[PDB]
Amino acid sequence: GRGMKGQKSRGRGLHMLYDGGQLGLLKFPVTRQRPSYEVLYYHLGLSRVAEFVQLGLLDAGRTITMKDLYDSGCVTSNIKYGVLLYGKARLAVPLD
Amino acid sequence: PINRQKILQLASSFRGRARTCINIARLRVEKALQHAYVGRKLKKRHWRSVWIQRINAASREHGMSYTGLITGLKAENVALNRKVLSELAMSEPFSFKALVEQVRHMRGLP
Amino acid sequence: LVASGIPSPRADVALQLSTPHGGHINRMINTSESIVELDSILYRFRKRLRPANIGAAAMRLEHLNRLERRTPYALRVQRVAAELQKYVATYTDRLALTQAANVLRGLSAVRHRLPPELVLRLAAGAVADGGAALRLAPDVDVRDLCFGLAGQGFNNTAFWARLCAAVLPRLRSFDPNTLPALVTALQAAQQLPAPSTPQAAVAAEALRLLSRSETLAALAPARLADAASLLAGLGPALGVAVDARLVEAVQTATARALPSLSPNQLPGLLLAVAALRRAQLPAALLATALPHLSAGAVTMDLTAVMRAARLLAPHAAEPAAADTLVRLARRTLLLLPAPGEGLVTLSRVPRGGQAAGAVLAAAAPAGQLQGRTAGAVEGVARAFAAAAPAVAPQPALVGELAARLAAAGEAAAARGLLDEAQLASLGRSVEVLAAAGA
Amino acid sequence: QAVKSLFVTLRRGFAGTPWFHRRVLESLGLKYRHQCVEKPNNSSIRGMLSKVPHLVVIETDRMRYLRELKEHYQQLPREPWVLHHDAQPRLTPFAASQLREHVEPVGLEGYRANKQPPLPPRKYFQEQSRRWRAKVLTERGVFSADACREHAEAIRPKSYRRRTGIR
Amino acid sequence: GIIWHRQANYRHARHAKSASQLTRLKRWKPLAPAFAAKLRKLGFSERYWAAPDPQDVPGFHSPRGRVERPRRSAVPDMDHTTGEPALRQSWQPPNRQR
Amino acid sequence: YKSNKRSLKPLNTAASWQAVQPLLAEQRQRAAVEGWRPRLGPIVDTCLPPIPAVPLPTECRRVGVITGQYSLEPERTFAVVELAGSQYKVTTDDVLFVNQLKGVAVNDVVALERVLLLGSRAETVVGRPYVPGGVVLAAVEEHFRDGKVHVFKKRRRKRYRKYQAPRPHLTTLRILQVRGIDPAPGDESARLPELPVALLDARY
Amino acid sequence: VFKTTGGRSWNPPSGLRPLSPAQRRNRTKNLALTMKNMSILKLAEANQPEVPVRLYKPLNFSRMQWMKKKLEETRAALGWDMEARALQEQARALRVG
Amino acid sequence: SKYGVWMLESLVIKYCDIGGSSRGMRLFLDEALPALRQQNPQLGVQQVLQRFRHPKLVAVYRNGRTKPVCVKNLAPAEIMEHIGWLRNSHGRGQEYQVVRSRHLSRSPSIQGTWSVDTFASQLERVNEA
RNA sequence: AUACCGGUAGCGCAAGCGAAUGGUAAUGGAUCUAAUACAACACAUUCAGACAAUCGGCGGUAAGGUCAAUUGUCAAGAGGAGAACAGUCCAGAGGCGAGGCUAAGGUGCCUAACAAUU
RNA sequence: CAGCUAUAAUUUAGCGUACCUUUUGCAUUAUGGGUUAGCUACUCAAUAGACGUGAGUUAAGCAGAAAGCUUACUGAGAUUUUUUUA
Numbered sequence A: 001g002r003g004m005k006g007q008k009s010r011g012r013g014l015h016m017l018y019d020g021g022q023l024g025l026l027k028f029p030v031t032r033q034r035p036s037y038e039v040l041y042y043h044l045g046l047s048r049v050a051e052f053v054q055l056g057l058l059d060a061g062r063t064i065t066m067k068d069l070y071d072s073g074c075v076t077s078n079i080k081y082g083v084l085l086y087g088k089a090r091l092a093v094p095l096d
Numbered sequence B: 001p002i003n004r005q006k007i008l009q010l011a012s013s014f015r016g017r018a019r020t021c022i023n024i025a026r027l028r029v030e031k032a033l034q035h036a037y038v039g040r041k042l043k044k045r046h047w048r049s050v051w052i053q054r055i056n057a058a059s060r061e062h063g064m065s066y067t068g069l070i071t072g073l074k075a076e077n078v079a080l081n082r083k084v085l086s087e088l089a090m091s092e093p094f095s096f097k098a099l100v101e102q103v104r105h106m107r108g109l110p
Numbered sequence C: 001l002v003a004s005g006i007p008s009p010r011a012d013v014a015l016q017l018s019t020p021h022g023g024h025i026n027r028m029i030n031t032s033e034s035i036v037e038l039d040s041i042l043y044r045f046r047k048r049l050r051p052a053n054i055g056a057a058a059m060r061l062e063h064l065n066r067l068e069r070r071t072p073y074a075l076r077v078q079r080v081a082a083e084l085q086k087y088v089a090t091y092t093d094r095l096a097l098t099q100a101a102n103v104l105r106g107l108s109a110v111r112h113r114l115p116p117e118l119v120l121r122l123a124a125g126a127v128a129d130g131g132a133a134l135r136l137a138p139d140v141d142v143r144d145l146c147f148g149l150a151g152q153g154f155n156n157t158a159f160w161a162r163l164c165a166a167v168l169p170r171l172r173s174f175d176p177n178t179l180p181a182l183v184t185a186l187q188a189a190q191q192l193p194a195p196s197t198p199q200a201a202v203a204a205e206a207l208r209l210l211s212r213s214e215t216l217a218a219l220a221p222a223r224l225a226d227a228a229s230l231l232a233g234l235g236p237a238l239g240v241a242v243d244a245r246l247v248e249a250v251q252t253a254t255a256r257a258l259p260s261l262s263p264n265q266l267p268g269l270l271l272a273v274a275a276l277r278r279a280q281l282p283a284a285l286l287a288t289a290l291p292h293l294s295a296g297a298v299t300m301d302l303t304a305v306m307r308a309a310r311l312l313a314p315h316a317a318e319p320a321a322a323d324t325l326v327r328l329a330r331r332t333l334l335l336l337p338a339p340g341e342g343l344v345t346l347s348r349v350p351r352g353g354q355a356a357g358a359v360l361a362a363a364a365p366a367g368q369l370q371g372r373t374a375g376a377v378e379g380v381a382r383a384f385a386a387a388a389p390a391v392a393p394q395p396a397l398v399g400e401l402a403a404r405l406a407a408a409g410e411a412a413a414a415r416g417l418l419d420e421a422q423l424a425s426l427g428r429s430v431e432v433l434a435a436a437g438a
Numbered sequence D: 001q002a003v004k005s006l007f008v009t010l011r012r013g014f015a016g017t018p019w020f021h022r023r024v025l026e027s028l029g030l031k032y033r034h035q036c037v038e039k040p041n042n043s044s045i046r047g048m049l050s051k052v053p054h055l056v057v058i059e060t061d062r063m064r065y066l067r068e069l070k071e072h073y074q075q076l077p078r079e080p081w082v083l084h085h086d087a088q089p090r091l092t093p094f095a096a097s098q099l100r101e102h103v104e105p106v107g108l109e110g111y112r113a114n115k116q117p118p119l120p121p122r123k124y125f126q127e128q129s130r131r132w133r134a135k136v137l138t139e140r141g142v143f144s145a146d147a148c149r150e151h152a153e154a155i156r157p158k159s160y161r162r163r164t165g166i167r
Numbered sequence E: 001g002i003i004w005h006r007q008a009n010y011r012h013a014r015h016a017k018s019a020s021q022l023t024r025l026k027r028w029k030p031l032a033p034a035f036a037a038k039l040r041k042l043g044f045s046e047r048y049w050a051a052p053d054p055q056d057v058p059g060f061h062s063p064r065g066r067v068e069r070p071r072r073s074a075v076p077d078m079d080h081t082t083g084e085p086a087l088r089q090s091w092q093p094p095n096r097q098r
Numbered sequence F: 001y002k003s004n005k006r007s008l009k010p011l012n013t014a015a016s017w018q019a020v021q022p023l024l025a026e027q028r029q030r031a032a033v034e035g036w037r038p039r040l041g042p043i044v045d046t047c048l049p050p051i052p053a054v055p056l057p058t059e060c061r062r063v064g065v066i067t068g069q070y071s072l073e074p075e076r077t078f079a080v081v082e083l084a085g086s087q088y089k090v091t092t093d094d095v096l097f098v099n100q101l102k103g104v105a106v107n108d109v110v111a112l113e114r115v116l117l118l119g120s121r122a123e124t125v126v127g128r129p130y131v132p133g134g135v136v137l138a139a140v141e142e143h144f145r146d147g148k149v150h151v152f153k154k155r156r157r158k159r160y161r162k163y164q165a166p167r168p169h170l171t172t173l174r175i176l177q178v179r180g181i182d183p184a185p186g187d188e189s190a191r192l193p194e195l196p197v198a199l200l201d202a203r204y
Numbered sequence G: 001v002f003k004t005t006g007g008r009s010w011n012p013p014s015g016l017r018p019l020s021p022a023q024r025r026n027r028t029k030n031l032a033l034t035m036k037n038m039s040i041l042k043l044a045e046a047n048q049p050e051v052p053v054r055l056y057k058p059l060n061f062s063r064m065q066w067m068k069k070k071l072e073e074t075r076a077a078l079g080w081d082m083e084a085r086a087l088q089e090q091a092r093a094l095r096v097g
Numbered sequence H: 001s002k003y004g005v006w007m008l009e010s011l012v013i014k015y016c017d018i019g020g021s022s023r024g025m026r027l028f029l030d031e032a033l034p035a036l037r038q039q040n041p042q043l044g045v046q047q048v049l050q051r052f053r054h055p056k057l058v059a060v061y062r063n064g065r066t067k068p069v070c071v072k073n074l075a076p077a078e079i080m081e082h083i084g085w086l087r088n089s090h091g092r093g094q095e096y097q098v099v100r101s102r103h104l105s106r107s108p109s110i111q112g113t114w115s116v117d118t119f120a121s122q123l124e125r126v127n128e129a
Numbered sequence I: 001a002u003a004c005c006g007g008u009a010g011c012g013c014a015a016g017c018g019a020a021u022g023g024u025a026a027u028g029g030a031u032c033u034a035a036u037a038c039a040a041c042a043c044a045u046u047c048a049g050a051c052a053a054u055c056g057g058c059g060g061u062a063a064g065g066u067c068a069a070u071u072g073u074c075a076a077g078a079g080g081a082g083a084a085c086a087g088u089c090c091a092g093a094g095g096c097g098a099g100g101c102u103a104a105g106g107u108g109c110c111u112a113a114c115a116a117u118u
Numbered sequence J: 001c002a003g004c005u006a007u008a009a010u011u012u013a014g015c016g017u018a019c020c021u022u023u024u025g026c027a028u029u030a031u032g033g034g035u036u037a038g039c040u041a042c043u044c045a046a047u048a049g050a051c052g053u054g055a056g057u058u059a060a061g062c063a064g065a066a067a068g069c070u071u072a073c074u075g076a077g078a079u080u081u082u083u084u085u086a
């Protein structure tokens, strides 16, 4: 399945990203902008917090802390640096 | 490619080292089967030509050609093909003579 | 701009999609502006869908099906509905009231009925407590849940009792235009009997909320049409009465909410106020709603031109009523197939989003003969036999109208969509129209 | 006498034909030689046919009806001719073999009559028996009952036939 | 899963270019499908232009460093004997090894 | 235009026309409320049926089943019968190997009614299509696969070879009698025992 | 064709060999068939009936297999009330029959 | 069958009790061989048992010929079509192939073969002109 | 119910006229579509071409020279004809048959087939 | 190129320019092989992509794990429902 007498016929001598000599992937600018922090934070939506409150997993009369969110599986990861809340959801109950 | 016992027993009746040595007999048997394909295809042409020669000879004995007899028999809706007409030419010459004189009669009415 | 013929990325969609936040599949669903675009999004992430994505997909399928004017029984809509039904069967006890209400409303408004044991599971999961699901969910979730369970059959009358017992203390904190959907959902099932009692109690308290002033002037337009219909249909049976305060408020707010109804909603509201005054069409209200009825008759479906023709049936001698009725006559002539299209061609119908089913509604308007329009050609025939002297100035028009009414009646009787009583009434109306036509 | 349809038959092939004539012949619905299709009589079909008049044989439906009637009446059965007009040479050894195989009744007795000695063992079974004997002489010894019995059966003569074919 | 990059021909020599050309070159464009397929198969999954530092997050700071030293990184790497097999056609044997 | 790449212009043209279609329908409907080619019934074909000639089609009739051993004395009459795909001049006590006949079984007696010529020493009935009343009775003897044919195809210097070895399916027919024409003097057939058969159909 | 030199014998040493009467007979037969084709085309253009004939064609195999696949994926994607709804109008059709 | 005599006197069937190649053969014996015995009353079907060997199908013919066929891993339909080929034949093998004119007869030439003497009297009148 | 685009061949003393095939869009096809169209789905191969006919540059209106355009074949294609024959003409080989009809080419003998018209 | 097809059946007729590799093109007077037997070339690990077949879904996998690590989810309030009618 290799064809006739090329360099592909010899086997393991040419990298997949070599394109002939025009280094096209080396013609684009390099950006060193580090993104802001909060991309290392866990992102949790108010919609998931409200969904867990309607399911009955979260107390909704007591305070809902990060420990309560971690134990009920509302945060589906290990919280390394913290939890960022983003939202715009409709809530019918008061929540601390 | 082809089983080695099959190649040996196909080359059984060859001559020389092409009978017993396996890798000479392999090429010889492959060429023999390529010959067999063309020979099978040429059987039909050879025997049709042989039949047409026999019809032409038996028709020219009675003064008619092959063309006249075939055209007259097809014009009278007689569906005898070349094989049975050649067999009638060889083995029933009186039947073939009757056919030739009848075809002369109806394609000689004016 | 990739390759000069591929659309350049939009500004607000790229600003919404490029977030550090999660929620990418739901944002891709919400920016899908047509049907197999949504289906390709569901295909790309089919090993990645969670209950929130299923609720968003059902709601978006509902909105995109209503956004075009194509039927919900199209094969694309039914394939997306069955694909979502697989995930609904997978997550049938994990769905919260938001997501269960989302999938129920989305699959009922595209008229895809779930298996009834799945509906039973999905409602018993809503009430598998001391009603605590219905007290943490907002009013829109209760409205969508009631609308979804009014479809899918499920006239259980024991589930509805505990739902109405859960929603009755919370009902006066609801926003005042979700109440007609609750009353319509209770009426749509076999609840509200004598054509159990907490259902009638919450319907009565909802209609008491809807009947008052200072809120009836604050409903959105096209919610006042359904509220007026529900009041005129259920006033003397259970709730409020004849009194002129309500009728004055309805007429006053109807005079303000006229331009914001689509033309399929105007004759329902005007027949609603006509039924309200019988528990008619008063002066100087018809003269300002009738230019809207003539300007909305260019894009108006056949049951809506029934309702407008029945509305304009009891008076035809007025010239404004007369040329409004001949405008409805030309509209009914337009969207009903000829007995023998030419407006637009079928090869150029859009597969896109905006009003592609409206283009398919022209370009051989046959094939839109469902059962609703099958009975509705009989209704339009009766309504135009009632309105004699408005169209009878045009002889060839009413003759061709009778020809198309008879042709559609014969075709839909051949399809098995009519019976002998409707056929006899259709025959009486078409012979009246054909006798008037010569 | 109105030409309702046309009957189009390829008389040429596809090889050597330019690709645009080939595409016109594809869109006429012709794939093989001697294949006749019935085409309507409108300006589209006539344009396709006037692009390729040297590759096809066009004929009217009336023309084809008259031809099919003519050859149908010609192929109808007629009365037979009755013509009045009023020692086999030699057969080869191979002809005698073939008639002995198929024509005269020679193989008509039972199996116990006309049975033959068996053919000698084919080379596969000889190799299998040779492998068994090598196994026996290895793991059981020369002086075993199996080795001695195999030698005793080898020494006795056997009644066989001769192979005639190549297998 | 689309691989994006900034447009080239914008770093310098901007005086010799029109206003529309400079506005056009500020935009980003996706990679061509063939190159993107090779990078995706090679295993390229970089979600950011540069890695966000685990420090600089509030509550997660160095015990003794006031912050840290950044170390700006360079981008040249091409040799036919040792670095970047992707940027060479074949492998060159070394120069006599002393 | 030298780019050897498919243009997106047909997609752009189709998009533009489909985009304007809802406006065209709405405005045309608004003018139709506020204010092309005739086609024929689709016929299957335009040539009326020619009523095809029925031949004496029964090449094999399955007249009867042979019960027991029989014998066939040779006769001085012959016939030419059209069978499988060819025609064979045939006599009584004759063996024909023909392409497998379907619907016939071993020991069955079949009637070959496609007789093209019937002949005796004295007269020959030459038959335009077929001779009426001419029938040849044949006994099916075998349904056997013939000898293997080695079909090998090879192209030199190209790595292409293909070998298959089919065995043809054939049927042995023993001819029992030729009917229709009679022997020229009827000199002698010895009146041999007449072939014991079931005769599930007969014509005599 | 039309080559005399160049070491490859496409012709005899004389640059062609002209048409035998068999070749001319074949070209005459083919030209006669072409002339009858275009004469028949002129006659069919001059005798075409108004509202011309449409012949029955089946669906091609691609539309046929595509639409059988589409119909089989309607059957899996039907709602629960659908076959009863179809059966109701099926009964109602033959009550009027 | 040659001259009415059925020509296949005996059929021998060998199989195995435990072998997996004899699944089809055991199914053929259990469900299909009574039908073969009822439909072929002239036949004689033996049943031999070889506890470690592949299934075989030995056909014994009335001209003394014998033909062994191996039927390993075959379904009862394929065994039935093998016996259909064995029963309807005289047992000729892969190597025989018959005369290519497909015709074989004693006495070809009624009226005599054409010779030099058949039309001798006519050809001298032909040469007379 | 058709519309725009082009400045060649030819012609003219020039300015300028100006085809045929052609491109593009709309409309109509119960004409074709055992398939087509697309794919940021995946796996390749190829990136040395040759000749024949029709129109050309450079050559000698030389070269199975080299380089353009259109078409075909070979490449990767057997069969029949051309005596033999990569590229010409006919014709696209699943297999078997001692069936029939034809194409290119033939119809004195080798070598199948009319002293047909003779 | 030493065979093929033959009812040719003590002997004839017809057909038939080996294989491989490399080439635009080889019977080629281009490469290779005296024959026979034995040995002789797309393997394995880690990682990445895709497809086929699944598992789990209380998101998945690794793990002894309520450590931990790697992938995956987290949003909008969008009029729609009974074959027509009081």
Ligand SMILES: [Mg+2]
Residues within 6 Å of the ligand: B038, B039, B040, B042, B043, J005, J015
């Ligand atoms: Mg030969």
Ligand SMILES: [Mg+2]
Residues within 6 Å of the ligand: B044
């Ligand atoms: Mg032939």
Ligand SMILES: [Mg+2]
Residues within 6 Å of the ligand: D012, D013, D014, D015, D016, D017
């Ligand atoms: Mg050609």
Ligand SMILES: [Mg+2]
Residues within 6 Å of the ligand: H019, H052, H053, H054
């Ligand atoms: Mg065993």
Ligand SMILES: [Mg+2]
Residues within 6 Å of the ligand: none
């Ligand atoms: Mg010029």
Ligand SMILES: [Mg+2]
Residues within 6 Å of the ligand: none
């Ligand atoms: Mg070319």
Ligand SMILES: [Mg+2]
Residues within 6 Å of the ligand: none
């Ligand atoms: Mg080719």
Ligand SMILES: [Mg+2]
Residues within 6 Å of the ligand: none
């Ligand atoms: Mg060739």
Ligand SMILES: [Mg+2]
Residues within 6 Å of the ligand: none
């Ligand atoms: Mg040749």
Ligand SMILES: [Mg+2]
Residues within 6 Å of the ligand: B034, B035, B036, B038, B039, J004, J015, J016
């Ligand atoms: Mg040969």
Ligand SMILES: [Mg+2]
Residues within 6 Å of the ligand: J020, J021, J031, J032
């Ligand atoms: Mg080599």
Ligand SMILES: [Mg+2]
Residues within 6 Å of the ligand: none
């Ligand atoms: Mg050497």
Ligand SMILES: [Mg+2]
Residues within 6 Å of the ligand: none
């Ligand atoms: Mg070896």
Ligand SMILES: [Mg+2]
Residues within 6 Å of the ligand: J065, J066, J067
């Ligand atoms: Mg633990």
